[PDB]
């Protein structure tokens, strides 16, 4: 079989910037190579076909060139709506195969995140489980420290965290942790607090409820 | 306008079987080659089969050959995919794609893609609770509110707000797969504080694979 | 291993992108190299600085 | 119509023992739907049938 | 950096 060795598997750049991603073939695959993009939640979508071609309806800004087994895309502009993994792919020989995929962010100011927290349902509470959720909205970079603490003491163990893929209108990432405990552990206790710590905060914020409270 | 819509997927059993389908509008599959190709977090994107309908000629990757096989019936403009003695490894996301289309030698058409999850784990329909606005939920004049979507198998879940009619400031979260082997998700929007009381908001939730279909109104 | 080489690529108008090269240590420093002097041609000689036993690299093209 | 070994992949596929329903018509299908296929379906419905012995 | 079947994305 033919593999497609891709690099990098991550990159990030800012608005306007000229962006190279590479794939190299194992052995001699002539012009076989296609690329394309896989937007989040979305089907992959032809960019370039043949090394060098441009898909109708893709901007003119996507290129790409072969030297070699060596094959190269490039993005001349980067745009925020460009955020995407990119895949290159060989049509040579039986099995096709696909290069391991290139990740590729936006880098923009930073953005101190909206911290909101939401205390478990009264419809949920009758089930005897009790989900308390802490969101972060809109902030930048992705990382950040989100802890838990329940009655002040740090919690462990018992908590998810899901993060949204970069936003392509305002190069954005939002987060949600979750905390569970069972209904009579949640009724043991009275203060619930969500601390958490990011770049563009001074100092990191808590925020938090007391049971029962309206 | 060309299309290709993929449908058959689900819950499975390992060596289970299922069937998929790959209907094609716009175009017709005798003019082309007609791929399957699977995309799963263990080998990414990976070909699986492929077919000439105009000569029934088939290939197939040495992971799936003897237990699943393409076909075409080009009466219906549609090709299919049997998976037979299904394993682990077999849960991907199955997309169909369509090679040689208009004499481009790429897949310049792919579905939407269906999901197969190969699994012992029976179904389970989800809870749909509120994340309601609250003094704990707002600054700067804006407002956060969602619904928590807990407790459900298999994958996927959709969510929409007021019909599709919002969906500006939505996040609809990714899956999280919690110790039970269940997933759980939250779908949140912020809106303008001054809104909640006089506008409706209403969380449309459907997992398909249980049926289940739940209309929330997340109120302050 | 599986280790990620961090990398910074530093263009001669001060731009700055990152890159991440996974594999391992041995594979993944091959590609960042390999990479670096692909983007030379366009962007003029570059210079690798290593940082953090090889696991960071600081790269900055000439122009 | 098929081939009298075509034919003869039918038939061992449909005595398997062990097989469920769902099994057996699901790998019936796959000869039905690529009879170049043949041999290699019918040792992999071959190794299911065993392991489920 | 490993495909999500949730997202249809690559995480890192």
């Known amino acids: 079989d033919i593999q497609m060795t891709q690099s990098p598997i991550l990159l990030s750049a800012s608005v306007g910037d000229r962006v190279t991603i590479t794939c190299r073939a194992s052995?001699?695959?002539?012009?076989?190579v296609a690329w394309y993009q896989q937007r989040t939640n979305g089907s992959p979508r032809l960019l370039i076909y043949?090394?060098?071609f441009l898909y109708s309806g893709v901007p003119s800004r996507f290129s790409g060139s072969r030297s070699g087994t060596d094959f190269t895309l490039t993005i001349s502009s980067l745009q925020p709506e460009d955020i995407a993994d990119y895949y290159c792919?060989?049509?040579?020989?039986?099995?096709?195969?696909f290069g391991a995929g290139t990740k590729v962010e936006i880098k923009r100011t930073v953005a101190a995140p909206s911290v909101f927290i939401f205390p478990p349902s009264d419809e949920q509470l009758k089930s005897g489980t009790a989900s308390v959720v802490c969101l972060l909205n809109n902030f930048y970079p992705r990382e950040a420290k989100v802890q838990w603490k329940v009655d002040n003491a740090l919690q462990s163990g018992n908590s998810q965290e899901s993060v949204t893929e970069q936003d392509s209108k305002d190069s954005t990432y939002s987060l949600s942790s979750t905390l569970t405990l069972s209904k009579a552990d949640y009724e043991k206790h009275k203060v619930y607090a969500c601390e958490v710590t990011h770049q563009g905060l001074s100092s990191p914020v808590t925020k938090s409820f007391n049971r029962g409270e309206c | 306008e060309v299309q290709l819509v993929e449908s058959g997927g689900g819950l499975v059993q390992p060596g289970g079987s299922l069937r998929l389908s790959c209907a094609a509008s716009?175009?017709?599959?005798?003019?082309?080659?007609i791929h399957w190709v699977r995309q799963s977090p263990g080998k990414g994107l990976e070909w699986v089969a492929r077919?000439?309908?105009?000569?029934?000629?088939?290939r197939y990757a040495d992971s799936v050959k003897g237990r699943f096989t393409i076909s075409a019936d080009t009466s219906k403009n549609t090709a299919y995919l049997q998976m037979n003695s299904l394993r682990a490894e077999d849960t991907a996301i199955y997309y169909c794609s369509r090679w040689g289309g208009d004499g481009f030698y790429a897949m310049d058409y792919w579905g939407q893609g269906t999901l197969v999850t190969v699994s012992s784990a029976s179904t389970k329909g989800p809870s749909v609770f509120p994340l309601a606005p609250s003094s704990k939920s707002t600054s700067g004049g804006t407002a956060a509110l969602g619904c928590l979507v807990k407790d459900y198998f298999p994958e996927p879940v959709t969510v929409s707000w007021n019909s599709g009619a919002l969906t500006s400031g939505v996040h609809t979260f990714p899956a999280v797969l919690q110790s039970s082997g269940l997933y759980s998700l939250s779908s949140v929007v912020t809106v303008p504080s001054s809104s909640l009381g006089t506008q409706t908001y209403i969380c449309n939730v459907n997992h398909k694979p249980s049926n289940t279909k739940v209309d929330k109104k997340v109120e302050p | 291993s599986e280790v990620t080489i961090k990398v910074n690529l530093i263009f001669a108008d001060g731009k700055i992108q990152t890159a991440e090269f996974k594999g391992t240590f041995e594979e993944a420093t091959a590609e960042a190299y390999r990479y670096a002097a692909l983007l030379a041609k366009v962007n003029g000689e570059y210079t690798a600085d290593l940082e953090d036993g090889g696991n960071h690299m600081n790269i900055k093209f000439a122009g | 119509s098929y081939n009298k070994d075509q034919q003869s992949a039918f038939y061992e596929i449909l005595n398997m023992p062990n097989l469920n329903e769902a099994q057996r018509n699901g790998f019936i299908q796959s000869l039905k739907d690529d009879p170049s296929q043949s041999t290699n379906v019918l040792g992999e419905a071959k190794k299911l049938n065993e392991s489920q012995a | 950096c490993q495909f999500d079947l949730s997202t249809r994305r690559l995480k890192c």
């Open positions: 043949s090394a060098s």
């Open positions: 052995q001699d695959v002539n012009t076989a």
């Open positions: 792919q060989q049509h040579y020989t039986t099995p096709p195969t």
């Open positions: 716009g175009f017709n599959i005798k003019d082309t080659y």
């Open positions: 077919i000439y309908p105009t000569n029934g000629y088939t």
